[PDB]
């Protein structure tokens, strides 16, 4: 019913092009919004090329969204026309399951992603009110929008596994985009932060602007050994193949390794690397609506943003190529509001 | 100073023989005890043959101990002559570290095991009072003694990771020496218990003798898929090589797999097997003195014992051989008090 336009790919090459379609009318509990900025990452490139078998074409990307409310339904009280809002990857769930009723609905077995019925790299989106967040006034929209993907991904497990308290010794493994964001949250929580990287080229970048308290080169066995058994937890953001044994060795007994990337090679985990000290390894995906709300207010309070490269709608194909397996520091953010046209 | 006798091995063959030695005099904070029953397990056989490189000869086994107090030091108030007591694997720690001061001293980097300075398959032992537990009156000494190794091993992580509440759906993988004990704790906590086993030979036992609420054959892919995403946690007691993927698939989102065995082959863990649902895997060794005390009183309250085969001192070599095959139903317990002589 409501006319819309955006970018879509016709096949698994992942090449996007201008695409007309339509969205539903603003129902009783829905929020229509004009999209202002569309944050972009690996997920988009992988979905565009059907990496996981479940993409259907034509495919419109867009899972990290900030925008301005254009309509609200008759029952919607939380939001009004003109409000700045955010939308994350998950926009519907079943509502009945244990994960849904305990407000950890990001883990609903039947969770529906925003890009399944056309993503929001598009002029307008329409989203059920319970999956929209009120954007804080003190947070920029362009450099803030990636907090809805990278930010929540780090934030959720940091809260869940108690890696969020002053004086915790927290490792960050990998310092791409995702790692930079996780690092900024760890600092804001008042943690003593160690960056673990495979190269000295990253040391200055780690230390900059009241960042890391320590830096470990993972290929230096003297440094890694010196830090054995010292960390309360590690946020592992490394996207490609790596061993978990050297990270597990940095943990204190009972410490926690949180895995956020999805490397192709399975991890090899000798039982002793967990048994010695009763260590924990856990993974995590995205976060709940309650967590995203708490997360974005915390970002605002502590002035946390992502490093971004802002782009026009024309540059999306080239960006896709460039972000592929790169976990780039300056996350590509599309200025939908100013550059997308009919 | 105080004359003692026991069984010791001379070399890494693991062959034990009668052995005279001596212990220290009962110091100000020590408890001397006559050993009544010495619980035995895989650790003893592996230590006897130097499997891990740090056994020194001559070697006296004995890490699961119940006994009668024969002397107490001038400062000891908690215990008196004639009291029934228990002693576990760990009998000293550094006292200064974070793990020591937070009463999780089983994870002390400098923890000293009872068998390092002659184990307690011997007529007498002398132990610092802070590493002795008061044996509850309603628990049998012979069938209770393995609770100090197997019982605490299951109990500690079940408390730590919240797998200890009524209505929790808890899997028990492996139904042997350690599993049968873990099963009994899960039942006592009021859990709905699923036994996961590689063979139908164990079904009737699981139901009739352990009151499992469900049984899964791990080599039946229809059964395993039917139980996908149903368990709050799994206690994995399987001692030899196995994959964790089928166990992780049984867990609810955010569920926990607790690993207690030490298989020789590393676990192969694809990132998706943890990422899909934000699952946790953790290992654990033994438990603290606070945990063992709480554990043994809970055992007594809920009438939890191990299934034991009692043996005389002369049978220890044969018992040890039989442990290579786990050829026991389900633990060997040495009657030290009645069968060990000068
Ligand atoms: Zn993203
Ligand atoms: Zn649901
Ligand atoms: Zn034992
Ligand atoms: Zn210590």
Numbering used by the authors:
A (entry chain B), B (entry chain A): 14 to 355
Excerpt from the paper describing this PDB structure:
Crystal structures of THAS (here referred to as THAS1), a second representative THAS (Cr_021691, THAS2) and the structure of the promiscuous homologue (Cr_032583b, HYS) were solved and mutants revealed key residues that control the stereochemistry of the product profiles. The HYSs perform a single, chemically straightforward reduction reaction that immediately neutralizes the reactivity of strictosidine aglycone/cathenamine. The biological unit is an elongated homodimer, with each subunit divided into a substrate and cofactor-binding domain; the latter also being responsible for forming the dimer interface. The active site cavities of the HYSs are framed by helix α2, the catalytic zinc coordination sphere, and loops 1 and 2, with the NADP(H) co-substrate binding at the base of the active site.
We recently reported the first cloning of a biosynthetic gene encoding an enzyme that acts on strictosidine aglycone. This zinc-dependent medium chain dehydrogenase/reductase (MDR), named tetrahydroalstonine synthase (THAS), produces the heteroyohimbine tetrahydroalstonine. THAS1 and THAS2, which produce predominantly tetrahydroalstonine, were both crystallized, since their amino acid sequence identity is relatively low (55%) and the predicted active sites have numerous differences. Structures were obtained for THAS1 and THAS2 with NADP+ bound (THAS1, 1.05 Å resolution; THAS2, 2.10 Å resolution) and in apo form (THAS1, 2.25 Å resolution; THAS2, 2.05 Å resolution), while HYS could only be crystallized in the apo form (2.25 Å resolution). Interestingly, a non-proline cis-peptide is present in the THAS1-NADP+ and HYS apo structures. Closer inspection of this region in THAS1 shows that when this bond is in the trans conformation, the side chain of Asp340 is projected into the cofactor-binding site such that it would prevent NADPH binding. SAD/CAD utilize an active site serine that protonates the alkoxide that results from reduction of the aldehyde substrate; this serine is replaced with a tyrosine residue in THAS1 (Tyr56) and HYS (Tyr53). Mutation of other conserved ionizable residues in the THAS1 active site (Tyr56, Ser102 and Thr166) did not result in substantial changes in the distribution of products. Mutations to Glu59, which anchors the NADPH cofactor, resulted in a slight increase in product promiscuity, perhaps by causing a shift in the cofactor position.
